[PDB]
Amino acid sequence: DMEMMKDRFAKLLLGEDMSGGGKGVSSALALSNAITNLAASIFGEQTKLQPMPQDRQARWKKEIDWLLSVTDHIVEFVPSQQTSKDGVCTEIMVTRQRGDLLMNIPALRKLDAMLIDTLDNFRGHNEFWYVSRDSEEGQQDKWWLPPVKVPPGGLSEPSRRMLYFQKDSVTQVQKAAMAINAQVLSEMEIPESYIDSLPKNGRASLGDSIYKSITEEWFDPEQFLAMLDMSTEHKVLDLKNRIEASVVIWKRKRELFEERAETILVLLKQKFPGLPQSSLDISKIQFNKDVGQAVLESYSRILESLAYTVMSRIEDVLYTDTLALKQTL
Amino acid sequence: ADMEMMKDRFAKLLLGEDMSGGGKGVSSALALSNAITNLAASIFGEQTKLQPMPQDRQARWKKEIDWLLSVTDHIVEFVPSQQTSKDGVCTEIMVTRQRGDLLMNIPALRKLDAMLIDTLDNFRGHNEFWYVSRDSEEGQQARKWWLPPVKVPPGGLSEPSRRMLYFQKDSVTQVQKAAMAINAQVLSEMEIPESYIDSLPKNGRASLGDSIYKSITEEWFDPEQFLAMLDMSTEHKVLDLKNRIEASVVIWKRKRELFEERAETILVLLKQKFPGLPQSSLDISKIQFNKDVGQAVLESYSRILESLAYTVMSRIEDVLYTDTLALK
Amino acid sequence: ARFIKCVTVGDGAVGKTCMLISYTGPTVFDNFSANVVVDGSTVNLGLWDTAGQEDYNRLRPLSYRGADVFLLAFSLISKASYENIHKKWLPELKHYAPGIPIVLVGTKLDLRDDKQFLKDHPGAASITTAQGEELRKMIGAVRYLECSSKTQQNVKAVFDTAIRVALR
Amino acid sequence: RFIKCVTVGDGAVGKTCMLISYTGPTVFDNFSANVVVDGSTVNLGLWDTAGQEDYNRLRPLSYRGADVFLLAFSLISKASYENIHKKWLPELKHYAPGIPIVLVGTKLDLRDDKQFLKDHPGAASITTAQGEELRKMIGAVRYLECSSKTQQNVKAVFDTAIRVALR
Numbered sequence: 001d002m003e004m005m006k007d008r009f010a011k012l013l014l015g016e017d018m019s020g021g022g023k024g025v026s027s028a029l030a031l032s033n034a035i036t037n038l039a040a041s042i043f044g045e046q047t048k049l050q051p052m053p054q055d056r057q058a059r060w061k062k063e064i065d066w067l068l069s070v071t072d073h074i075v076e077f078v079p080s081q082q083t084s085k086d087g088v089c090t091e092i093m094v095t096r097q098r099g100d101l102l103m104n105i106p107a108l109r110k111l112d113a114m115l116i117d118t119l120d121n122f123r124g125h126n127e128f129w130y131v132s133r134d135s136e137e138g139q140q141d142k143w144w145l146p147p148v149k150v151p152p153g154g155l156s157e158p159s160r161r162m163l164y165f166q167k168d169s170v171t172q173v174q175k176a177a178m179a180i181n182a183q184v185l186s187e188m189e190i191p192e193s194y195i196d197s198l199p200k201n202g203r204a205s206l207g208d209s210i211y212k213s214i215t216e217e218w219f220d221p222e223q224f225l226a227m228l229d230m231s232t233e234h235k236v237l238d239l240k241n242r243i244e245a246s247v248v249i250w251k252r253k254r255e256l257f258e259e260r261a262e263t264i265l266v267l268l269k270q271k272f273p274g275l276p277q278s279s280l281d282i283s284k285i286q287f288n289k290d291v292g293q294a295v296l297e298s299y300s301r302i303l304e305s306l307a308y309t310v311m312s313r314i315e316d317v318l319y320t321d322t323l324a325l326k327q328t329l
Numbered sequence: 330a331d332m333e334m335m336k337d338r339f340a341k342l343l344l345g346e347d348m349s350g351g352g353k354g355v356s357s358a359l360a361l362s363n364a365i366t367n368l369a370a371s372i373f374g375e376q377t378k379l380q381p382m383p384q385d386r387q388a389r390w391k392k393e394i395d396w397l398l399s400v401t402d403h404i405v406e407f408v409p410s411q412q413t414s415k416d417g418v419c420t421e422i423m424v425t426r427q428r429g430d431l432l433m434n435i436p437a438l439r440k441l442d443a444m445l446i447d448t449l450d451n452f453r454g455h456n457e458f459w460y461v462s463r464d465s466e467e468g469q470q471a472r473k474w475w476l477p478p479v480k481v482p483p484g485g486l487s488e489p490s491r492r493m494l495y496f497q498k499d500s501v502t503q504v505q506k507a508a509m510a511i512n513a514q515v516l517s518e519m520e521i522p523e524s525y526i527d528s529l530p531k532n533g534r535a536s537l538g539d540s541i542y543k544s545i546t547e548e549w550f551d552p553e554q555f556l557a558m559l560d561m562s563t564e565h566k567v568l569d570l571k572n573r574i575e576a577s578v579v580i581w582k583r584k585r586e587l588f589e590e591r592a593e594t595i596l597v598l599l600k601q602k603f604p605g606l607p608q609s610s611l612d613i614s615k616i617q618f619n620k621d622v623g624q625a626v627l628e629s630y631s632r633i634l635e636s637l638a639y640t641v642m643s644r645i646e647d648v649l650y651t652d653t654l655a656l657k
Numbered sequence: 658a659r660f661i662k663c664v665t666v667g668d669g670a671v672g673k674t675c676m677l678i679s680y681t682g683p684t685v686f687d688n689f690s691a692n693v694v695v696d697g698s699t700v701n702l703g704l705w706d707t708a709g710q711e712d713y714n715r716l717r718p719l720s721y722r723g724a725d726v727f728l729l730a731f732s733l734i735s736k737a738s739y740e741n742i743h744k745k746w747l748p749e750l751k752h753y754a755p756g757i758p759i760v761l762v763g764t765k766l767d768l769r770d771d772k773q774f775l776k777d778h779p780g781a782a783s784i785t786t787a788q789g790e791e792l793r794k795m796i797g798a799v800r801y802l803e804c805s806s807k808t809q810q811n812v813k814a815v816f817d818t819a820i821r822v823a824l825r
Numbered sequence: 826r827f828i829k830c831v832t833v834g835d836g837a838v839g840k841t842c843m844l845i846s847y848t849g850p851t852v853f854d855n856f857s858a859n860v861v862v863d864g865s866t867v868n869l870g871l872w873d874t875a876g877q878e879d880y881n882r883l884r885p886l887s888y889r890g891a892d893v894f895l896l897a898f899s900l901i902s903k904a905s906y907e908n909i910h911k912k913w914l915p916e917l918k919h920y921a922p923g924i925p926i927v928l929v930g931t932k933l934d935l936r937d938d939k940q941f942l943k944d945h946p947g948a949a950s951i952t953t954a955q956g957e958e959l960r961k962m963i964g965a966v967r968y969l970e971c972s973s974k975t976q977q978n979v980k981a982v983f984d985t986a987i988r989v990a991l992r
Contacts, residue, residue, distance in 0.1 A: 001332065009339040010400045011854060013357045014622060016870070019859040020404030020428060022620030023827075023868055027343045028352050033855045036884060040876030041852040044836070070340045074350030077691040077702075082809070091813045093680060093693075098350060134947030142879065143904035144836035234919050277885045285885055289352030291344060305880040312879075341687060346703070349692040353701065363688040366717060370709030371674070371685040386683070407858035407869075412976075420976045423847060423983070425858075463670075464780025473712070474737035475669035565752055608718035616718060636713035643712075 005066055008034070028294035032285065035067050035295070039302035046306075047145050048130050049313045051120045064112075068299065071105055074098045074292045100187070101292055104180055108299050114173050115306050118166050127151055127159045128317045148316045153328065155321045163321075167314045174307035178273075181300035184293050185277075190248065191287035194280060198249055202257070205245040214260055221264045225271070233275065240268050241279045248280070335396060338364070358625035362616065365397050365626065369633035377476055378460050379644035380452045387446065394442070397626070401435050404428045404623045430518065431623050434511055434631075441504050441634050448497055448641055457482060457490040458648045479647050485655040486648075498645045505638035509604070512631035515624050521579060522618035525611060529580055533588065536576040550591055552598050567603050571596065575611045605639070659698075661823045662723050663816070664705040665762075666746055667730035668738040672764050672806055674708045676730070679806040680816060695820050702820060721753035726823035728815065729796070730762045733769040733803060734781040739792060747796045758822040761798035762815050763789045766805040826865070828990045829890055830983070831872040832929075833913055834897035835905040839931040839973055841875045843897065846973040847983055851875075862987055869987065888920035893990035895982060896963065897929040900936040900970065901948040906959060914963050925989045928965035929982055930956045933972035 012034060015024025024030065042060050046052060052060070080094040096102075130146040131137045138147050155163075203211040213224055230236055243261050250258045268275070277285075288294055342364060345354025354360070372390050376382055382390070410424040426432070460477045461467045471478035486494070534542040544555060561567050574592050581589045599606070608616075619625055665673050677686045681704075690703035710717040727750055731738040742761075750759060768774050769783045786803060793801035799822050804811040832840045844853045853873040859866050872891075877884045894917055898905040909928070917926065935941050936950045953970060960968035966989050971978040 002335075005332070005335065006396065006399050007403070009336075009343075010403050012343060013339075013361065013400050014403060015357060016855045017857045017868070018403060018405050018407070018425075019857070019868070020401075020431075020621060020623035021859070021868075022356060022358050022622055024357075024857060025855075026352060027345060027354075027357065030855075031343065033886075037852060037854050037873060037875070040873070040883065041841075041850070044851075044876055044879070066336060069336050070343050071350075073337070073340045073344060073348060075348050075691060077348070077693050079813070084808075088808075090809050092809055093813055093816075095681070101350075132945075132947075134945035136946060138947050142836065143902065144878075234915075274882075276881050282885045282889055286889060290350060291352055292350040301883065301885075305876070305883045308880045346688045346690050348689060349701075351692070354690060355688070360688070363719075367685050367687050367706065367708075370706070370716065371683050374669070374674075374709055374712075375683055405858060407860055409980075414975075421980050422976060423860075423980055425848070462780075464778045466779060469780055473669070474735065474741075475671075475711075605715065607715055613718050613722055617722060632716065632718075636709070636716040639713050 026289045028289050028291040032294045032298040035298040050122045071101050111303050127155050148320050150320045150324050154325050170307050170310045177300050177304040184296040188284040188288050191283050194283040202246050219260050221267050244280050356620050358619050358622045362625040362629040365629040373637050381450045401431050438630050444504050457486050479651050481652050481655050486652045501641045508631045508635035515627040519615040519619050522614050525614040533577050552594050572610045660701045662703050662725045664724050665728035666707045668741050669711045671730050671732040671738050675806040724754050726819045727759045728762050729759050732765045733763045733784045734765050743796050759798045760819050761793045761801040763803040766803045767807045826867040828892045829870045830893050830986050831891045832895045833874045835908050836878045838897050838899045838905050841873050842973040847979050891921050891924050893986040894926045895929050896926050900930045900932045900951045903949050926965045927985050928960045928968040930970040933970045934975050
């Protein structure tokens, strides 16, 4: 709580550059990574659907507080008034937490607590259990996870009941987080290095046939997508990046094609709520210097992925239950 | 208590002083460098008497400087090495060890620090000299107005007291030199910033110029007489000279070695003749644009230690000066 | 999109640090910068203390470089601090920053007409607004304000004007 | 000069332990230090990918501006071996084709441990020859077998990454 905190904070001022040359990254990028890395270490041990063991919980509670606590000091410096008991009104400047931090950080802490809460509902005895990956019973996707086993002939209905209930709870948590993430990302500045990577114009970025489709007389984003090869997640990714590239260009008449493209973007989000982040997203995070947004984005990201771990770990039990029932009726 | 205060301090550092959090702040080096100076100012502003540092403030000082210095425990060299197992197998590994320039200077300075607090601590207990409120009645009999007047006995100090006071003054001036050297050294290792180089005039003569440049480049040379040839009656004038010569050195160290040596011997005498003369343009420019955290901590820590030394030195001298007056 | 360096300079026991801490929040004033909206404008403000430099000058080598405005401060209850403005400080600014605006601030306004304080502190002696204004015209400061960290009177006015003059 | 080096591969392969090993509760923060290579000094930036295997959206920066990748599988997990070609190669070849790969086989201390393999029947030892087939298959620049416990070839790994990323 001294020699422990000290290290973490100091490693951050070096900005990753342990030579001390300050050829490191921004204080923001250093914070984004620190959070990412911490969540991976803690969440990586959550391989079973059971409460997070008391000390891992303590580590998590306190470490993240350290990292999140920089946001307490990010302020708006605004004019206000005050009035003494004597009666006099004097003008002062005053300090309030920044707009996008006031509501969002506590929202994310609520989400954090909701997930730790949901794992806690598996305290003690559950009807499902886990086996060693490398035992005999273990050999009976992500191979590193202890195979889950379920009573032969199904799971008690009150057990299945709570499973479905927490999964919905977690799925609403995952969405909540993703919304905040998406929100931070939209407000992060477009890096100078991205605009430079951009092609000369729309057609070049969109490609010949795509550009002709988005510029036809009539346009239907539903027909459009059906026409294209969306078979692999890499392909949707490439399209999203191409469209995104256009929108950036155009936003510098052409508003129709511009509105048309943003219609597709929304559809891409709706038909593919799970996509990895676009070139632009990556670029924004890569170069962002705003430490407030740095924290909002990575915190929302790890929470999204904790939420996913739990959704994943629930879905295992359920799938496993289902298989054991299908072994009869 | 020391979570709330500590985290707090490290935060505003991550923020590069830019409290709007938009990252348009200042390098980590400079933030730290400022933090070190601001704290010292704050702590030794009140330490205005020649007496032990109020035990609490002393603990504040120890822990607070301890926090800012900790970055240096993590600044490393990453060097090839070896290790042999309990079975004689030799494995080639990579080792971390503290960066050269910090491994010796951080404890050097920490030591100078304790040496200064210790010097104040020797004044634990009763002293022959005493202090009087600046705006009271006994303080009105006194001809840096904010320091409480010092007073000494009618007949003047004992020889033992006046002796200890001299002994401490010597001791303290040694620390001031030790710090001044560490400061001057790290400053000579810091990168010359691009903006500085864009301000440099075309030629050696262009910086000096015509008159002074002739002098330096002559057949014979005497550094004392070189200074005696010049008007050195004010800080500004000496300082403008130091700037003139350092500009020329950078010009030369960039192109001749004889003039480069003569110039360096002039800067060397300038340290002897006018110690306590301000940082040069080049110095200030270095500190402004320095990204190196290690060096930032090295330069500021030495700087404030040098200045606490001067303070204690001045405290002693005010006693020895009023002792002089009490005899005469 | 326009940065302002605002350095406040003066003697000891004049309460620079205090004025600064009062404006923002022993006590430290750390180099503090923050976006401030002044007269519809969205300026980037950065405030420097000079505490301790009045003792050792070599302590703060970044005090004058890149300055945009100065707050020259003297204590309305110290005549020496008033004398030092033009004898000691004005020469420093005329040399290291020719042409940058100075705002003359007379601190400790709550104490100036304090009958009991001036009674139990014979050495303290109050300075008049007229006398403060005379100093302004003499050192050529753009404005003169008397303020107080205890009450915060005109403190916010000190900086509002500083920023306004810093800008062109 | 600046090098970004990224360790990629499955879970329970020892990614993080390898890095903690090389440099110095398993936590590896992004690390950067000066190293001298055959004359001049380069700045080495090491990246952990821990957790990505579980949820891809966790680590958006993993592949960007990478100079060299260390593809790692466990010598006692055939699934981790299969995934190098089934799962990880398609990713690097999508986000960063033409960035050099170094095949790393971890848990070298456990590979011929007759006792351990008997105790964990599910675990299965990959031979060097088998790792070389895998090297030539994914077009890796070099195949190395190492151990975090022992420290064998760990420096050889990063020495290779360093050298190959400056071609």
